[PDB]
Design a protein around this ligand. Structure first.
Ligand SMILES: CC(=O)SCCNC(=O)CCNC(=O)[C@H](O)C(C)(C)COP(=O)(O)OP(=O)(O)OC[C@H]1O[C@@H](n2cnc3c(N)ncnc32)[C@H](O)[C@@H]1OP(=O)(O)O
Ligand SMILES: CC(=O)SCCNC(=O)CCNC(=O)[C@H](O)C(C)(C)COP(=O)(O)OP(=O)(O)OC[C@H]1O[C@@H](n2cnc3c(N)ncnc32)[C@H](O)[C@@H]1OP(=O)(O)O
Ligand SMILES: Cc1ncc(C[n+]2csc(CCOP(=O)(O)OP(=O)(O)O)c2C)c(N)n1
Ligand SMILES: Cc1ncc(C[n+]2csc(CCOP(=O)(O)OP(=O)(O)O)c2C)c(N)n1
Ligand SMILES: [Mg+2]
Ligand SMILES: [Mg+2]
Lengths: 872, 699
């Protein structure tokens, strides 16, 4: 069982042509680059039959025209191993010791020389010999990891736990990284991980009490929110403190909640870290919250959200000073082997794309594992980049605890079955070297077992409560009754003046200057448009001292060139953020941060959700370019935004700004899928609104921000109505009007007694209907707007309908197809909420399997048809 | 305007310590590995302010302890440039010519030496000098690309087209690759691409008639399905023939339909290619349908479906002999610059993960572009692996034709605005070298313009039909009235006996043997369970002569250990597929193929959808591990499966097997979201069923 290729008999070669000194230094570069290909990183003597074996002839001396006869000859190695001259024998020994033992490194791909040299020096120096106390501490962690898994197997044989057996070295690895971070003087470590060994991590790393874990297996689950639905045991988060064993350092450890959907936590945990770092506010030299992200090998290679999130690592609005990635490479998925799982040689090969170091470490060598954890954490601190650890291990049992893996992988599990564990191996190693005594070895096992038995007994003696019906989370949070969202005239005037207070040598772009000038004058004269109404909300909130973050694709300028949150001087390319400067001058340390996201909805929205969780006091808005593309981030909407509170008691105030409107731009530039958002809405999960005026949008945003209702807000924003003069708001609507209006009654009714027909509408379609009403002089029609879709303001709608006693019929008018828009929601619910209301008649486009027509001229035809149908 | 670093004044260094021969060969490896970092691949003199500039000191001779005084000294280069000895001056010249001109190569990361040597030899040999006929042909393609874009700008000023202006070299690149494939004797090229320059590709590459394109701008759209809703002009597919200009080769070219959702076509087009290759049935030496996949730089880096699909390249049930990837690197998204778009140095850096060559080529050097296209196609044929071309270009106008990019990128568009086009540059180059004459240059421009004017006039003289209401696709296809789906007793007994007809030295796993024994006896005694009922359906269909493909996570065994489509001998690890063997013995060339998918729903289901489109006669079933995870492939369900027929007239018979049932396994192992599937269902778009008996599922 020698891993290297034997020396080959050959005749000595003359030192002609390429010099042997050249050949030697080529050999050195070969090992530094490709030495990992033959490194002893695999605990099993296993090669996957269908996996292409890479060529590694570059590591043989024959390839470099060197022979056994050169071994004792001296060569100039140019400072290799801190020596100018060396024998080939010594060169080979040093190369093999550094690159072909338990740690396989990929770093030569790194372009920065200082980075490469830093890694090179440390890898070639080797792992320092640990102290006996350190060795004993590693054994304790290994023991705890294995004993915990074995205890659950004994007490709960027929319960799914996703054991860490075969990968117990993860616990000392994580502990090593966290301990190193504590010694660096950092503030917190945020962990995101999958199912694999989650309970083990919760107990041994985070420090969740053992009683809680045992209660979960018994059936008693800890409730997050009052009347919450809950979730399985291996989807929950926790918080704890980590104290340095051999130091005075202390660091906070947090584990984030995640769904069963693999790798969905990646963008969320990054956002949490960023929000935490921003709160600490230690500047560019800070970044004192460490993201520690765990992955499975199949998921890391398979799913695309992984590289998508890594892509955010160095972006201005997303940088967190690097993420430590640990891939638990157990060399299998559920049943799919790596041959059928990926096309890459290594699971961690995405690191090559991003120019980040990779450490492949053998999961049966705990000391090497601990060293790699320390080295990775030091690299992150020094260079502020992502680092990838490939923990090469195996999965002792099936995917779950009630599955037989021998049916499909008989040969692989012939090697796995019957092996001695890493704990056993390490104990034998320590005893062999005389670094540990026998009675100490038995003490470690006995002490920990007694701890678990005692705790188990206390849980058992407690009474087992029977199953009960779960109510719901409808009234778990309070509505802000009596809250006034208007600002003073002085505040409004000051917000307007922000766009006039340009820096000394700053000039607006000629096509932006009119927009800025209008904003300065609108706060007194009027004609405040949608974009200005939105910025007034965010500006006023930032003035009060809040951190307001707006992110999304093309958000700084706006997709429709409406926002201009940050203006750029054409000449100097100097940026100017008027509202941020105003906020900072008010002395409440308010901030208005606007970022252009990367081309991503999944990672984009996920990051903003995470931000809202990491800092509850921040106002975070994610803007889609079009609402149609939000379905790209369906996992985030389904698993986090909509159901986060009910499953985990995790609340968020995330705002989604989704452009919506049927204007004849095709099936993927028309609808934000209102019907899908309303289908997810239950037990008052989130607020869904489609405001018709800038002022109403202003009030909606402020109500959300100033309330204690910690639930998401989904706003369907307009496209063409951004520049519609009829929609503009007066200044009094921001200062005199105190509250958001969920229902706006018809402002053009001369006599309410004459009204025979009432039209319910939501969004831009009102203005078309209003225009037609004025043109035709229809005094018998009243057009009522519904600004808030969910929850349903049935009291306000009833009140509006009651104001027209002679109303015979009620029409629900929408631009969307019949099987889309708010109709399907309102058709089912509204009749129940208002029994006395007449039978609603739908007026809309026909039901379609698509969103909208591709033909623009058809759109005009259907629009005309739609309005004609409304007016008899 | 000299691109290289000036030679530095320095004193001569003694040949002490590391030998200078060593240093020289280190320099050679430096250029082969990292020479691309300083290659003249960018048409613009532009560096993105927020983008981290990589260190490239390894390419300076000073770093290797060499000086100007070594330039004329001779060193042993060990067969570099087919010579044993060389001066440092000559070494530098050859390295710079091969690695720092218009083509930047990344290949040293490739682990296979034969692959690496093959690429090394061709890159260091250099681009062969093209003939005047070849040069003239490149100009014609450049002219067609630019003139087409300019014509649309003139005739339809206020209409969105997503022009290819600034990236016109894409057309000769694609033509080069397709021409090379025709010369290799291959059967078809399947293209998947985004919006950027789609109309240009449809006309100049696929060969869609120009009248059709002009009609679309007028408002007259070609209807796919009777009463279909349709889609915008730059989402449609087409088919055509490509004839070799300088050869007797001929190849079929197809462009697949796609939604506005970027990179969603990637898994679908791969499935189409695989289905086509399987139909041809030329074995492992075949793979004669080329996937040519185009990407934008922001989308290629940003979206995760991209690496997700590339991950399928070498899998048993998904291998198509390699995909040719072209990334149109115009160095911008909508408004987001690469600094705010990616963290990778290059957009094509995913290739490093998969161990595939990358060619960065300057989009203003047409001859280099054409060479790279040929080299990529040859590499695919030889090694059967993915190859990545980074076409470094720019975007002349805004994202669309009605957007001002100067508001947000003033400095970048100070360089872009006012440039001479690649066509203009190449024409001037050809005239300068005397490879082209003046009257020929004017002929190319005039002849093509006259072609477009004539066609435009014929479209204009035709009557413009008014807008009409679109009915629907409910009755566009007929229901099978009177169809009987029962099989004979003899057929049923034979299907049962398939599990008893084990190979000579084959034995079942002890926990599988009871299942096999029950299947043999159930066909007479009874008690046929769900899994057996399902296999009886697929088996009976394969017997008739159909290609039945079942794919999904853990599908061969089954998530719930129910299927056992392929049995494995514990001892020998020998596989046995009873139903496939039976089908092949019936003499109708039927097949029952069962595959374990990778960990992916998006790419997994997308590939099966593609398979159903590429071969209409095949029976394709995708199985989710649990129905709950199907929402991972929401783009495929929304944009392809549910609405494919109504938008493009593209039909599919894909079967989705989604495990469903409330049994107390938690919120992500209970529901397949039946309510969501029923909400998409309209105008009889798809069949949704929940059978209660195995027989009913069979029928
Ligand atoms: C996400 C949520 O808002 S949780 C909602 C809790 N309730 C439910 O989900 C079920 C019961 N729902 C209901 O009774 C209605 O849907 C309600 C709550 C909207 C009340 O209906 P109406 O009285 O017609 O609506 P109206 O717009 O007048 O709202 C009444 C008050 O609630 C406030 N309110 C209503 N919805 C919200 C909301 N989403 N966020 C904040 N405040 C809200 C209003 O600001 C108003 O305050 P006020 O008393 O100072 O005037
Ligand atoms: C996706 C589609 O199937 S497109 C369906 C076309 N129609 C529509 O979309 C509009 C709605 N129309 C209806 O619902 C029609 O009345 C029906 C026929 C589909 C409803 O079926 P019913 O008459 O209630 O029941 P039944 O299941 O007996 O259907 C009658 C026949 O249609 C066939 N059929 C019904 N649905 C399907 C289907 N999805 N695929 C194939 N055949 C079908 C049945 O096999 C049966 O054939 P038979 O005449 O040989 O007995
Ligand atoms: C997106 C998604 N697809 C499928 C599943 C089902 N699933 C859960 S764990 C698992 C295996 C993944 O293997 P790997 O990532 O290697 O992790 P391991 O279980 O080996 O630690 C699968 C398919 C899931 N939860 N999420
Ligand atoms: C998934 C998705 N997100 C967002 C969009 C909106 N969008 C359309 S084109 C575009 C820019 C794409 O940039 P790049 O990939 O570089 O292509 P280019 O337009 O520059 O050719 C964006 C974000 C989309 N169509 N699909
Ligand atoms: Mg795994
Ligand atoms: Mg681009």
């Amino acid at each position: 069982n020698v891993p290297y290729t034997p020396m080959r008999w050959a005749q000595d070669v003359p030192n002609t042509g390429v010099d042997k000194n050249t050949r030697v230094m080529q050999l050195i570069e070969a090992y530094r680059s490709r030495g990992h290909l033959i490194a002893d990183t695999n605990p099993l003597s296993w090669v996957q039959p269908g996996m292409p074996v890479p060529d590694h002839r570059d590591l043989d001396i024959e390839t470099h025209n060197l022979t056994i006869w050169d071994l004792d000859r001296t060569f100039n190695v140019g400072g290799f191993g801190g020596k100018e001259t060396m024998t080939l024998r010594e060169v080979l020994s040093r190369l093999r010791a550094a690159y072909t033992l338990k740690v396989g490194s990929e770093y030569t791909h790194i372009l920065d020389r200082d980075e490469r040299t830093w890694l090179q020096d440390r890898l070639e120096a080797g792992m320092p010999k640990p102290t006996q106390a350190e060795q004993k501490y590693i054994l304790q962690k290994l023991n705890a990891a294995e004993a915990f898994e074995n205890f659950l197997q004994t007490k709960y044989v027929g319960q799914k736990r996703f054991s860490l057996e075969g990968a117990e070295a993860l616990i000392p690895l994580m502990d090593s990284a966290i301990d190193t971070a504590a010694g660096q003087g950092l503030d917190e470590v945020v962990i995101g991980m999958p199912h694999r060994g989650r309970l083990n991590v919760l107990f041994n790393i985070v420090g969740k009490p053992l009683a809680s874990i045992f209660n979960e297996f018994e059936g008693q689950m800890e409730q997050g929110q009052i009347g919450g639905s809950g979730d399985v045991k291996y989807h929950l988060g926790s918080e704890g403190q980590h104290l340095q064993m051999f130091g005075d350092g202390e660091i906070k450890v947090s584990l984030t909640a995640n769904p069963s959907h693999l790798e969905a936590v990646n963008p969320v945990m990054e956002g949490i870290v960023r929000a935490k770092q921003d709160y600490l506010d230690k500047g560019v030299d800070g970044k004192t919250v460490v993201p520690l992200l765990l992955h499975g090998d199949a998921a890391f290679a398979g799913l695309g959200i992984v590289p998508e999130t890594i892509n955010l690592a160095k972006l201005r609005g997303y940088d967190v000073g690097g993420t430590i990635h640990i891939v638990v490479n157990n060399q299998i998925g559920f049943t799919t082997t790596p041959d059928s799982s990926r096309s890459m040689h290594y699971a961690t090969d995405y690191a090559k794309a991003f120019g980040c170091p990779v450490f492949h470490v053998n999961g049966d060598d705990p000391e090497a594992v601990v060293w790699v954890g320390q080295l990775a954490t030091e690299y992150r601190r020094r260079f502020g980049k992502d680092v990838f650890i490939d923990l090469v291990c195996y999965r002792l049992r099936g995917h779950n605890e009630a599955d037989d893996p021998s049916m499909t992988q008989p040969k692989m599990y012939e090697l796995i079955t019957g092996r001695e564990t890493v704990r056993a191996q390490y104990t034998e190693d320590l005893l062999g070297r005389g670094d540990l005594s026998n009675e100490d070895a038995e003490a470690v096992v006995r002490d920990f077992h007694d701890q678990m038995e005692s705790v188990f007994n206390e849980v058992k003696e407690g009474g087992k409560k029977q199953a009960e019906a779960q109510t719901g989370i409808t009234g778990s949070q309070k509505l802000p009754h009596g809250l006034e969202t208007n600002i003073s005239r002085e505040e409004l005037l000051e917000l307007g003046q922000a766009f006039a207070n340009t820096p000394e040598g700053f000039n607006y772009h000629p096509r932006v200057a009119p927009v800025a000038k209008k904003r300065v004058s609108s706060v007194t004269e009027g004609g405040i448009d949608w974009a200005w109404g939105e910025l007034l909300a965010f500006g006023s909130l930032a003035n009060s001292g809040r951190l307001v973050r707006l992110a999304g694709e093309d958000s700084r300028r706006g997709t429709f060139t409406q926002r201009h949150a940050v203006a750029i001087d054409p000449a100097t390319a100097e940026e100017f953020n008027p509202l941020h400067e105003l906020a900072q001058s008010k002395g409440n340390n308010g901030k208005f941060l606007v970022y252009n996201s990367a081309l991503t909805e999944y990672a984009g929205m996920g990051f903003e959700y995470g931000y809202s969780v990491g800092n509850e006091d921040s106002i975070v808005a994610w803007e889609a370019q079009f609402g149609d593309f939000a379905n790209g981030a369906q996992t985030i909407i389904d698993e986090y935004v909509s159901s986060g509170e009910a499953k985990w008691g995790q609340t968020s105030k995330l705002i989604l700004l989704l452009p919506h409107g049927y204007e004849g731009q095709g099936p993927d530039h028309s609808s934000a899928r209102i019907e899908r958002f309303l289908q997810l809405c239950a037990e008052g999960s989130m607020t869904v609104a489609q405001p018709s005026t800038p002022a109403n949008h202003f009030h909606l945003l402020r109500r959300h921000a100033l309330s204690d209702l910690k639930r998401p807000l989904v706003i369907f924003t307009p496209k063409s109505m951004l520049r519609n003069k009829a929609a503009a708001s007066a200044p009094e609507d921001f200062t005199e009007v105190t509250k958001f209006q969920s229902v706006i009654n018809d402002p053009n009714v001369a006599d309410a007694a004459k009204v025979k027909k009432v039209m319910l509408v939501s969004g831009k379609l009102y203005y078309e209907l209003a225009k037609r009403k004025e043109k035709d002089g229809r005094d018998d029609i009243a057009i009522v707007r519904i600004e808030m879709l969910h929850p349903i303001p049935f009291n306000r709608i009833s009140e509006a309908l009651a104001g027209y006693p002679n109303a015979e019929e009620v029409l629900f008018v929408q631009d969307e197809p019949a099987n889309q828009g708010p109709w399907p929601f309102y058709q089912e619910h509204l009749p129940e909420l208002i029994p006395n209301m007449p039978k609603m008649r739908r007026v809309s486009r026909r039901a379609q399997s698509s969103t909208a027509t591709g033909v623009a001229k058809v759109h005009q035809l259907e629009e005309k048809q739609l309005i004609d149908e409304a007016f008899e």
